[PDB]
């Protein structure tokens, strides 16, 4: 209950497809666009107590306030899960590094077209875990 899967990427559009993907596949599970810091907290604190998962869109030159954010979510307790379309890029490279070193984990699809997909596959479960065995 309450896991917090934060979708990622540069461009807006893809968020707004990936956002309507998410918001049909379940409307109890709070698909929230806002690129804030303390209102993603506030957010978090309502999706815990739903016991429900929340799912964040941050933009790629927004995603340098997520680490903010990274403290709290990890003072919850909550499984972080940040969904991140990963494109070759130094400044998506430059905070993606951050979270792996830290230990939150990032799932980078690496495109658009898949990303979506993944979200609501994830829906289908929960969204804590890759979905294929990450060898190469």
Same mark, same amino acid.
């Given at each position: ?33 806002? @690129? ?51 494109? @070759? ?15 939150? @984990? ?6 658009? @077209?898949?990303?979506?997909?993944? $979200? ?8 804590? $875990? ?7």
């Amino acid at each position: 209950m309450g896991t917090v899967v934060i979708v990622v990427s540069n461009d807006e559009r893809i968020l707004e497809e990936l956002l309507e993907v998410v918001l049909k596949s379940d409307p109890n599970v709070k698909t929230v666009r806002t @690129d804030d810091k303390e209102k993603v907290k506030e957010e978090i604190e309502k999706a815990r107590k739903q016991g429900r998962p929340i799912v964040i869109f941050i933009r790629g030159a927004y995603e340098e306030v997520v680490r903010d954010i990274v403290e709290y979510a990890q003072k919850e307790g909550l499984r972080v899960l940040v969904i991140k379309v990963a494109q @070759d890029q130094e400044l998506l490279e430059r905070f993606y590094e951050q979270l792996k070193k830290d230990g939150v @984990d990032v799932r980078v699809t690496d495109n658009e @077209d898949e990303a979506k997909k993944r $979200l609501k596959e994830l829906l289908e479960k929960v969204g804590s $875990l890759e979905h294929h065995h990450h060898h190469h």
